[PDB]
Design an enzyme around this catalytic site. Sequence first.
Site, PDB file in Angstrom:
ATOM      1  N   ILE A   1      -4.651  -9.707  -4.337  1.00  0.00           N
ATOM      2  CA  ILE A   1      -4.984 -10.211  -3.012  1.00  0.00           C
ATOM      3  C   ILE A   1      -6.390 -10.815  -3.038  1.00  0.00           C
ATOM      4  CG2 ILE A   1      -5.686  -9.486  -0.687  1.00  0.00           C
ATOM      5  CD1 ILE A   1      -3.245  -7.532  -0.750  1.00  0.00           C
TER       6      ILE A   1
ATOM      7  N   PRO B   1     -14.434  -4.173 -14.621  1.00  0.00           N
ATOM      8  CA  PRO B   1     -14.558  -5.630 -14.770  1.00  0.00           C
ATOM      9  C   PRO B   1     -13.211  -6.348 -14.713  1.00  0.00           C
ATOM     10  CG  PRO B   1     -16.057  -4.558 -16.250  1.00  0.00           C
ATOM     11  CD  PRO B   1     -15.146  -3.479 -15.710  1.00  0.00           C
TER      12      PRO B   1
ATOM     13  N   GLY C   1      -8.374  -7.752  -6.737  1.00  0.00           N
ATOM     14  CA  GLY C   1      -7.010  -7.547  -7.187  1.00  0.00           C
ATOM     15  C   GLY C   1      -6.224  -8.834  -7.009  1.00  0.00           C
TER      16      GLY C   1
ATOM     17  N   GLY D   1       0.825  -1.199   0.000  1.00  0.00           N
ATOM     18  CA  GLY D   1       0.000   0.000   0.000  1.00  0.00           C
ATOM     19  C   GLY D   1       0.862   1.252   0.000  1.00  0.00           C
TER      20      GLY D   1
ATOM     21  N   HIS E   1      -3.928  -4.837  12.649  1.00  0.00           N
ATOM     22  CA  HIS E   1      -3.320  -4.719  11.330  1.00  0.00           C
ATOM     23  C   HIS E   1      -2.112  -5.648  11.161  1.00  0.00           C
ATOM     24  CE1 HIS E   1      -2.874  -1.417   7.986  1.00  0.00           C
ATOM     25  NE2 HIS E   1      -2.822  -2.642   7.495  1.00  0.00           N
TER      26      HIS E   1
END
Lengths: 321, 321
Positions: free
Chosen positions: B159, B182, B157, B79, B288
């Site tokens: 992940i 899409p 994605g 990220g 997290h």
Amino acid sequence: LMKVFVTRRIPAEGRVALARAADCEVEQWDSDEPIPAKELERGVAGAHGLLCLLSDHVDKRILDAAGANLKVISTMSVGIDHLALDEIKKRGIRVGYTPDVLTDTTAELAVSLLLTTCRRLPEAIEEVKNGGWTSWKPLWLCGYGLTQSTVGIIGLGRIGQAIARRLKPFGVQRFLYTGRQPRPEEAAEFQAEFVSTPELAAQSDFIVVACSLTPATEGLCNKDFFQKMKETAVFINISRGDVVNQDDLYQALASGKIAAAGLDVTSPEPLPTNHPLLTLKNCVILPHIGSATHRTRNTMSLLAANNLLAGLRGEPMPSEL
Amino acid sequence: LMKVFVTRRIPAEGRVALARAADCEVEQWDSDEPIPAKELERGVAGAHGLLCLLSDHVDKRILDAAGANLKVISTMSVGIDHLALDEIKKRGIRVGYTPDVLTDTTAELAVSLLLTTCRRLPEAIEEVKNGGWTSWKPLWLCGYGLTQSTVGIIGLGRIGQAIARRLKPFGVQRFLYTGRQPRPEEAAEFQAEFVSTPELAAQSDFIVVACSLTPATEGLCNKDFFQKMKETAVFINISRGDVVNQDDLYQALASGKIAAAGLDVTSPEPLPTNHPLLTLKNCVILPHIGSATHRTRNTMSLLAANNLLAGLRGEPMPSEL
């Protein structure tokens, strides 16, 4: 009416069941609390059918109280090591368990226990609560995952295959299932390698126990087994507390024979709250919730409800033993 | 010797490498705690290279404190929403990060978080410790499983793809996903239907939010989103807390709009104690720990290092943004 006794409050699907079985005389212990052996014996009286639970011990002590009438026994469990199969079959009494219906939920929980343990979720949860959490930390709460891992499964039965199946997509490069007899037809899907216990405890990054409880399984998982394991390996058990030697397991987790354990069953049940296993931050203990989903529990109860009526009436059972 | 500032203690292999780069005079923040904004701006002075982390808000401020020398910013993470990209590009500053090397582990934790919530492990564990466990119980601690379930993922994605992949074997009847565009080829091996946000919360039994925050999703998952979800559904978030409204979701759990929630991310971090969100059993918040395995973090560390050197040595980067 054909008398029948139920050991505890079961899911509605089944309670409404036997209730509708006019040809039956159903008595019920209206509690969630297990029934004391003394009350149990006082309950199997004049009963032609017994509907019990895995917790209920159906030994010579009960077959006696029951009496000649005892013709059928239905349990909302798949297990059978809590029944006096001899005293039972001797008196020609038919038995019945709940196979298949819990196979997908159980394997599901086993994988939940494995992940919850190796990913240290419990510890993580307590730290957010106690304030130990201050920021994203790179060396904090790290555990061992399943990538290129080697999973060892003890007693690969229905669930055992259902566990391997849910694990195969996690990155497992190899499945090994120990057991008394080979099942080359049940290993093919996973290319699993049937192995002996020595090489297992020594070759696994994860070890999962999903086997029935027989004299050969009792204490099957002890010090020697735990010492042979990788000190970075995780130990999971969702079978019966007696396959494992808890005193050896605890010392192993305290010293470092292995990295962590996840148990859905103990000896005895319920594990005392002051027990040593509960003092270890690296041992997960679930209160035996393998089959704990609404759909499954309801199905199990109905199966037991019908294995009872089918049984009693003399006809065949939907799931006999 | 160009200056290099590392905002935190990082995994060994990554630290040495930097310590290996003769051309480097690596400077580091000695601590596992997040570095205040002051010391950061007092730390990136002159530095030519900055190695950060999620906590470190690398906005326009650190940029002015860093100055002209700053040529490359590398971060141990996939990220990058913690960076001020525009100001960074306008100055012509190269970026660094470690995408892909943490995919599996993160997808792995996401599944772990989903299972402990739906199968209610946290509550169970506590029933063991507090003394609520008295026997096996057919109606106690039962949850919702994945058999024939519909999974609604937000962000298919790399992940998201790895999440659905581990979910299929659990019996998911059908996978669905939504996004700003899409992904038929990406969702080809999984058999998923490109649905809509509204229909998403309507078909899914499990809601796994997997993706990167967008300038429009901030606040997305609100009172209107949970209402569209099945009461027996399950909400999971492992991306960013922005999308979640710790008050709207609060209602769904506090009343029953949704069955339960599990978050491995929150807005902001850390989440205070006496706070509302954390005062709900059916809440599952993790600090997290998505990429929290030894191999993953170490791999992330070594890659951040490598990008760093390549960022200051005028060469191609193994993972430049």
